[PDB]
C-alpha cells in the first residue's frame, strides 16, 4: 500500500508517512500575476544543454525519466536567481486523463495539459545524494505543455514509450537533444519550494517559464498509453499523475518581467 495517485493512497494520504506534507515550503502554488512582483534586481537565466549526454529512459511506477551522464559539467543552469552552478541529472513530465487538466502549477488558477520538470544538482555538494539534504541542493525548470501544432523535438521520445509500458522496463536512449524542448523566451517566476513527490524534501529553487510549449493532441494521448501497473497485474493506466497547489505561507513569488 505504498504512496501513489488512487483513492486510497494519494495525495491527501501521503502525510502519515512524511509529515514534512504539510510544511512551511511545499510545492506546487497557484502564481497569482496581481500579486507576483516584478524584481528589477533579477539576473537572465542561463542554460546550457549544447554538450547533453542522455543516456536511458524508465518507467518508475509514477512517471518516466530520460537519465543523463552527469559526471562532467555538461548540461548546466546558472545566473538568473542562482548563486551556485547546478548539473542536469533527469528530466519527467505530469499529465492529465483529458486535456483539461494536468499540470501541477497554475495561473491565475487555470491548468494546462501536462508540465515538463528538468532536474539539476549544484555542484558545491559533490553528488546528488548529499544535495537533496540541502535547502539549497536543486533548481528545477518547470514548463507548461498546451494543445496545438505539434512539437518535433518530442517526437523522438513518444516513439519509444513502446518498448516502457509496464513499471520497470527501460531502454537505451542515446542523442536526445533538451534543447528542442525549450520555448522562444526565457522570461520566468520564481520561489523556495520543495519536491512534488514523496519524500517531498524542501530543497527546491523553482524557476518556472512563462511561455509554454505547443504540443500536439496525438502526442499527449501517447503518454496515456503508458502503465502504472507492473507485467501481469491488473491493468491501471498512467494517467492524472499531478499534486494539487499547496498554501503560499508568506513566501513570495518574483517575476524577471514587467
Ligand atoms: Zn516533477
Known amino acids: 500500500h505504498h504512496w501513489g495517485y488512487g483513492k486510497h493512497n494519494g495525495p491527501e494520504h501521503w502525510h502519515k508517512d512524511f509529515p514534512i506534507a504539510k510544511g512551511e515550503r511545499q510545492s506546487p502554488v497557484d502564481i497569482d500575476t496581481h500579486t507576483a512582483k516584478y524584481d528589477p534586481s533579477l539576473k537572465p537565466l542561463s542554460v546550457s544543454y549544447d554538450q547533453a549526454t542522455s543516456l536511458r529512459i524508465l518507467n518508475n511506477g509514477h512517471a518516466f525519466n530520460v537519465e543523463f551522464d552527469d559526471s562532467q559539467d555538461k548540461a548546466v543552469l546558472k545566473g538568473g536567481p542562482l548563486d551556485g552552478t547546478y548539473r542536469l541529472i533527469q528530466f519527467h513530465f505530469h499529465w492529465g486523463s483529458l486535456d483539461g487538466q494536468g499540470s501541477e502549477h497554475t495561473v491565475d488558477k487555470k491548468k494546462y495539459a501536462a508540465e515538463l520538470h528538468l532536474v539539476h544538482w549544484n555542484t558545491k555538494y559533490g553528488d546528488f545524494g548529499k544535495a537533496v539534504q540541502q535547502p539549497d541542493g536543486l533548481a528545477v525548470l518547470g514548463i507548461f505543455l498546451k494543445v496545438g501544432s505539434a512539437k518535433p523535438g518530442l517526437q523522438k521520445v513518444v516513439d519509444v514509450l513502446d518498448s516502457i509500458k509496464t513499471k520497470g522496463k527501460s531502454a537505451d536512449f542515446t542523442n536526445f537533444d533538451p534543447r528542442g524542448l525549450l520555448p522562444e523566451s526565457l522570461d520566468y517566476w520564481t520561489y523556495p519550494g520543495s519536491l ?14 512563462k511561455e509554454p510549449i505547443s504540443v500536439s493532441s496525438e502526442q499527449v494521448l501517447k503518454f496515456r498509453k503508458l502503465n502504472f501497473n507492473g507485467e501481469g497485474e491488473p491493468e491501471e493506466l498512467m494517467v492524472d499523475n499531478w499534486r494539487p497547489a499547496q498554501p503560499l505561507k508568506n513566501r513570495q513569488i518574483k517575476a524577471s518581467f514587467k
Open 196 to 209: 512534488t513527490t514523496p519524500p517531498l524534501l524542501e530543497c527546491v529553487t523553482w524557476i518556472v517559464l
